[PDB]
Amino acid sequence: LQLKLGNSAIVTQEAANYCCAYGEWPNYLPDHEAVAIDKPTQPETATDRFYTLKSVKWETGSTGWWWKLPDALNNIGMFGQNVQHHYLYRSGFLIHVQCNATKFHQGALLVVAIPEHQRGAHNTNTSPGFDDIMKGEEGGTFNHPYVLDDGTSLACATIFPHQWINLRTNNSATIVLPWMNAAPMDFPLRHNQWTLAIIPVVPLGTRTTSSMVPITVSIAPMCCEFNGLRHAI
């Protein structure tokens, strides 16, 4: 009942299932000598560590949260240092979301992971700037969660890989994400493939007022590799 991955280990979970997004794992670049032919360094022992983020607060009037996954780890730790002085990467992720409330709370979350989530501004003709997208570690907040901030409805948002956190039954979710991009290797400082988003469908309630019910998100790059920084001559 623990996830010992490298240096750190998130211990003592509830029973959980590795629901692979779609049907695949990271795979480590099977054969491309036609592109960027300086063999990828492929670091493996010094990146896989479950970078746990800040705990967020779930109150009655809360409305949703979103993180951009290559963006949330650009300034954190050993993966954050390899984003500078490298310009190509290739990695898949693993996400473990776990809230904790007693047996007197009630509610439901939708933990969904959205590939290529192009956002949209409400009621204007101007595209979103650089600062409304690259928020960072803190993430963001849905302004209009019913339309997922781009017009496509939430009722059909179960077509993506998703799990439910229903506080009557469970309090944990786990999604494994493969490399979802058209190009074989991508640029980390300006493109964001996945977009982890959690949305409370049924809001919480109790007899007293505004119980926090804090949530924890933990992200770990699975099978990462970068360009080569060391060459013979």
Epitope: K54, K57, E59, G61, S62, E138, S210, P214
Partner: antibody
């Protein structure tokens, strides 16, 4: 380090309104409630209300329902409070405190005060 | 709800009653004459991190009190109470 820096003092003729600010720095602003207090000079204190900057829900004391309004800004990390229809008995010092992560009312960080 | 604090001035057990029961849920504050406020006791018996350990609080259903063993020069400050049980939350009168 948690700091609650309020504005300098100001005064106004009766029949007007006034707005103050309690700028906070050193923590994540959208997690804690921002309570506001009132102390007449020489007496005890009194609870006015709070603002929830994660949701912008406010809850006022029953005496101060029509006097004060409460807002909160996320970008500038600053909580405001605007009075209305000032009289002679509004001359007091006004405080601002911080709640807890779990929504309990025990105050460990405070402002310096602002006379009216 | 109204809370009354029985001594009006002090010249060292400062007690305060309550109109109802509050089930713990009481804090003790202090105000320096410069204008700084920090709490001393939270949840009627515990001590804040960074206080001299001579302070202590009693516990009951409705009648709570503070106990100071020895006195000091800058110990001289007006002491307040607070119930956080039900909104609107009310202070007390204060001593000294």
């Amino acid at each position: 380090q948690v700091q609650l820096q309020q504005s300098g003092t100001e005064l106004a003729k009766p029949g007007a309104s006034v707005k103050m600010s309690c700028k906070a720095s050193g923590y994540t602003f959208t997690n804690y409630w921002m309570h506001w207090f009132k102390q007449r000079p020489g007496q005890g204190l009194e609870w006015i209300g709070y603002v929830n900057p994660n949701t912008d829900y406010t809850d006022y004391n029953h005496k101060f329902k029509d006097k004060a309004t409460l807002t909160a800004d996320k970008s500038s990390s600053t909580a405001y409070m605007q009075l209305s229809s000032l009289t002679s008995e509004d001359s007091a010092v006004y405080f601002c405190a911080r709640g807890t992560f779990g929504n309990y009312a025990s105050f460990a960080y405070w402002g310096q005060g602002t006379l009216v | 709800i109204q809370m009354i604090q029985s001594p009006s001035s002090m010249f060292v057990s400062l007690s305060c009653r309550a109109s109802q029961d509050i089930r713990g849920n009481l804090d003790w504050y202090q105000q320096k004459p410069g204008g700084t406020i920090k709490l001393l006791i939270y949840s009627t018996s515990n001590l804040n991190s960074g206080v001299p350990s001579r302070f202590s609080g009693s516990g009951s259903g409705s009648d709570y009190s503070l106990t100071i063993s020895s006195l000091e020069s800058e110990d001289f400050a007006d002491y307040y109470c607070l119930q956080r049980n039900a909104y609107p939350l009310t202070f007390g009168g204060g001593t000294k």
